[PDB]
């Protein structure tokens, strides 16, 4: 209420506060105290500071066991004491901004709202299928090629199955720890929730789901798969990230494909991953471009890059591609990251990385691996290229790595399978304009033999495909020679691969 | 009342049918409905990117309250939309804004908890009525938010939240973060198939469903600025505007997908449009039209011809740039002129290209010239050269001129560029290089090529000079290159044809000046026989043409001797060249 | 009424013929008319380096509304130039900018979408002390305001592309700086008004020499 | 014009500048021009830098000879022309 008639309301109370004739119990924040009171230091002494520490997990458990019955009587549901101890423990582990017991009560109360909404209308999967069948109903109405009425028939059948099963049980009217974990996995993003059977069947086939995109390379697919299975099962070291890997080998063996296949598995898109191309980081300033500017400097109030983009979605994959192409002491930021999951940015708030999968591709032993992947067992190769890495890095940073793996030069059956994959995506690119493509098996032999050399991996297969198909084929498509509808066969001449129209 | 003066009823507008139909957004509406029916903190904030449908989730929630698709507990709730500007506007005295806000709080306590308040732009609430010593709307809604008396549905942006609401941590913890992700391609198709009826009712036209799947796919692929389903709706609506004007001017009546590609080609410049027959026959004559400026060197003309034919025919690898060429040859055989032939074909201009002159980059930090300086350092706010040059012009041609001069590790930036088509500047955003033609022009093996181009076939020449380049670059980097072409030294007849090209462009320029010039073949023979040596390329040719033509020619023009409208016969002397006026 | 306190009716001025006979720039007017007939985001922003005649484009739009060269959705509109410098005039107290601006927005809602607004120097609207983008921003979003913004290229990419919400509520119309021949056509269009004001004659070789020397010797 | 529920002078005359109904002539210091008129758009291109030179010593002599009669007829005194050139020279020499 200060104005031109400046009486400010801190001044009128102030002799009553100083003389003790007013018993004013104040309560304020800890930043707001410093920012608004300790400016005006004539009133900062009138008060006495009672500090209210953040409670422990066990004190939060003791708090929730007497608040429980009030939320029970509001939502008309029960809360079972495993959900209380799960709310306190999980909210202390997986939510880093808020503080106890605000987030514990938030998980409890929102879970009870979720159970009340189950009991009110109908359960979850009924609503999932109900929204999707009304979606496909309106979309099929608007489509008046389809390949859609199959999907609507499938979802309506599954809706009828779950509706009859719901009538057979006519459920959840308590709050178990499963509902707390569902509300935690919708708060933050970390899949803490219990694995429903489709996801568990998907996750036991991790290697089978990844070898549709990474052919060969068994050891690293195993390592990646074991890290994610430990994370979902609940055995990962809770004071470190999920998996801190270091990939090694020649050029074009699927390193960035293994990371893009991780992202396409786990988040259903290739470029949903914090990607730090470490080859911009050749000087010691890129430290500042990932942790941000310090106070006083230019990009302070715009943040860092690694810190902010992980703190948005705390469960993600981090790729540090071409990790040898950096200054050697950019890997001390990663010492903090890989040992404890904490990275303090410029502004002072510590982003938590204990749910991210840090992956570092490289090529540091390419000469050695290309020389000796034959006639050597995998353990001795890992040993000797780890000696090479010890010539590169410092023994701090490679002690923090969860597993160093070795990639190997691709054989000819590998390049046959890769040629099949690249041709499937070429069929997808040319089906959209309206062209159907087959291929002779003799022609695939020409692709596998014209795109093989041991030193460059599986990129010469890609540009051999590019030349020996895509240059005459796009030559003919622009020529108007190849009309859609008819199947474009890929047959060979004596050395060429010609397209025909029959 | 003090609500009707200052709020806007959304359920009344949904009942009147003014709102957009909201299709999709299942789990966002469901989690918001869960957070609204809590005991304490009935406060969902919808934190998402700008454009992804954060308001439309709230209006879809109002439409479900109208239709009855909500649970029984929310049937009949009045979604009121707060207006911060309507509160601040009439309050300049001490305590009029706070009076209005306390009146709103008393009415929303009076409404029996039957009101779901809504604030788009929650940060406007954060700094709302804050004057010198005034209770803003943050500090006055701050008690009635922690007790669930106010059922406020916020909405804010993902980066505006960091600026304004994480500044004030108590009002930051009043709200629950319901995150609204940018939708996928299929969901954008479904969202457009919902809203097709509204744009057809407005523009009085029809929209065909191939144009909708084309709008969603092309907007997801090419436009990097805005987001889904906003940019796809923009392509739909601007194409419908275009068809409505082309009906209404003086023909079509249904939006096709090529209309969507036209609006995309006008927004960006990437030629996604259908090939007209003039441009398609122009494009099949790629090699001949590059040999209308670059005679000689058939190989890379074939290579770049094939690359642009792939780019236009849709066979281009969409996770990579269009072509990533390396040019290797003796000095002065038209490498830079092959790139200028590219720019002159592609954009109908000569220096219409992003031209990095890599002999400036002889140390490790001109890397930082091309990307920019990080946070904290000097050239932060000015960006980078390459990143602004490509972000402002997506479909361009990048020339790394004279790429042998630099430090050996400037070409790691290019590892990112040539592998995935992306490059992160200092300010933390990536530029999409899925549309450029990255071209490098070295001369690492000009001694070897000038020595042994004779008696060695082209494949083994490429093999040998590529082995030398393998000694000079890293195996990671030559693996990324699309096609390492090799340039051959010029012959005599090639230099004669180059001189013919120079004379014809000189005659065209001086005809634009207003003159008419003829020449005898003997002058051409003298020009071909005087300035020949294979070691120096076609530049001694052009400077000999320069001297032995343009010194007497400009000597005689400036005297007024050459009257325009005559015939300038470039005859010869016993040893030199002189022009006459007959 | 708040419009008459702060707006300038351009079409009423072109009705009395005070404006310039804008000749050329036809495709930019056509793209602006494409933008102003959408459903949402009806708000073009004219963008180019300064001096190239963007207010001239909106004057030509107003003259086409007066003559009737517009489609059948713009006959009868009024083009009102808003003055962002005039709303931040008496900015003493709290909530006095918002009173003026809400008066303008209520009176524009009163006309039932009949008024094209022209907010020149659009970089003023971002920083107004929250302030001014956040009262226009929902009405800009729904397309019930038809704000023809007009700002410099560098001011646009410094002020408005920093702020993504206000950036997507507009639509760019890039204004190409005219050629030498187009400047000659402009001066041949505007020769008569200057010869009827100065009461002198102007020699057309001096016109084409003036355009050529101005393009050559001033950067 | 810092008023209440009202307008100032500048943003009420600003319509009359770009409407042709004002033949205004301004006068200001260079610095306040370079802050307050170069920053605006319409106020910039409705105004022209007629720069005023600080005059020379003999020009000041001519001006003082043009105004010697007024001050002499005012104060009933007489002014000497060597006193004029001494005053002008020492005023430009000493006063800052
Ligand atoms: N095992 C594989 N399965 C399928 N495609 C593969 C495989 N290995 C390589 N490729 C293809 O070859 C390309 C090159 O592989 P990348 O992983 O990108 O190279 P890299 O492994 O990153 O090695 P560097 O050192 O980064 S060049 C990939 O993008 C795929 O298109
Ligand atoms: N699920 C959806 N159903 C229908 N229309 C949608 C949907 N999502 C987005 N839209 C449309 O997308 C456009 C923009 O969405 P908006 O919510 O208005 O943007 P926004 O989410 O408000 O983000 P800001 O912060 O206002 S820029 C509108 O035309 C909406 O109708
Ligand atoms: N086939 C050709 N047709 C026309 N002009 C050509 C041809 N080959 C070379 N030239 C001329 O060669 C001259 C020099 O070409 P540039 O490409 O600029 O030199 P360069 O190829 O870059 O060699 P370096 O190593 O960079 S010095 C140009 O002025 C061209 O006119
Ligand atoms: N096509 C045109 N027809 C007629 N006059 C034009 C044309 N283009 C520009 N002009 C004139 O050029 C001048 C430019 O006027 P303005 O539009 O105010 O300037 P501008 O191009 O908008 O640049 P700014 O950023 O507003 S200073 C005026 O005298 C116009 O009459
Ligand atoms: Mg890689
Ligand atoms: Mg919004
Ligand atoms: Mg060159
Ligand atoms: Mg202007």
Residue numbers in the entry:
A (entry chain C): 287 to 430, 441 to 466, 527 to 858
B (entry chain B): 159 to 408, 527 to 858
C (entry chain A): 159 to 287, 293 to 382
D (entry chain F): 287 to 382
What text does the study give?
We studied the disaggregase ClpB, which contains tandem ATPase domains (AAA1, AAA2) and shifts between low and high ATPase and threading activities. ClpB is composed of tandem AAA domains (AAA1, AAA2), an N-terminal domain (NTD), and a coiled-coil regulatory M-domain, which forms a repressive belt surrounding the AAA1 ring (Carroni et al., 2014, Heuck et al., 2016, Oguchi et al., 2012). ClpB activation requires two signals: (1) interaction with the Hsp70 partner chaperone and (2) binding to substrate protein (Lee et al., 2013, Oguchi et al., 2012, Rosenzweig et al., 2013, Seyffer et al., 2012). Each AAA domain extends a flexible pore loop bearing a conserved aromatic residue, in most cases a tyrosine, which interacts with the backbone of the threading polypeptide.
We therefore made use of the derepressed ClpB-K476C M-domain mutant, which mimics the transient state of ClpB activation by Hsp70 (Oguchi et al., 2012). To allow stable substrate trapping, we used a ClpB-K476C-DWB variant and incubated it with an excess of casein in the presence of ATPγS. The states were numbered according to the position of the AAA2 domain of the seam protomer F, the region undergoing the biggest conformational change and were termed KC-1, KC-2A/2B, and KC-3. KC-2A and KC-2B differ only partially in the orientation of AAA2F and show otherwise identical features; they were therefore defined as KC-2 and are described together unless specified otherwise. In state KC-2 the pore loop of AAA1E engages the substrate at the highest position, above AAA1D, while the pore loop of AAA2F is dissociated from the substrate at the lowest position. In KC-2, substrate engagement by AAA1E is linked to AAA1E activation as the arginine finger of AAA1D fully moves in. In KC-1 and KC-2, the nucleotide binding pockets of AAA2B–AAA2E show clear densities for ATPγS and receive arginine fingers of their counterclockwise neighbors, defining AAA2B – AAA2E as active. In contrast, the arginine fingers of AAA2E and AAA2F shift 12-16 Å away from the nucleotide sites of AAA2F and AAA2A, respectively, defining AAA2F and AAA2A as inactive. In KC-2, an apo AAA2A provides an arginine finger to AAA2B, while all other clockwise neighbors of active subunits AAA2 C–E bind ATP. Similarly, substrate engagement by the AAA1E pore loop in state KC-2 is coupled to substrate dissociation of the AAA2F pore loop.
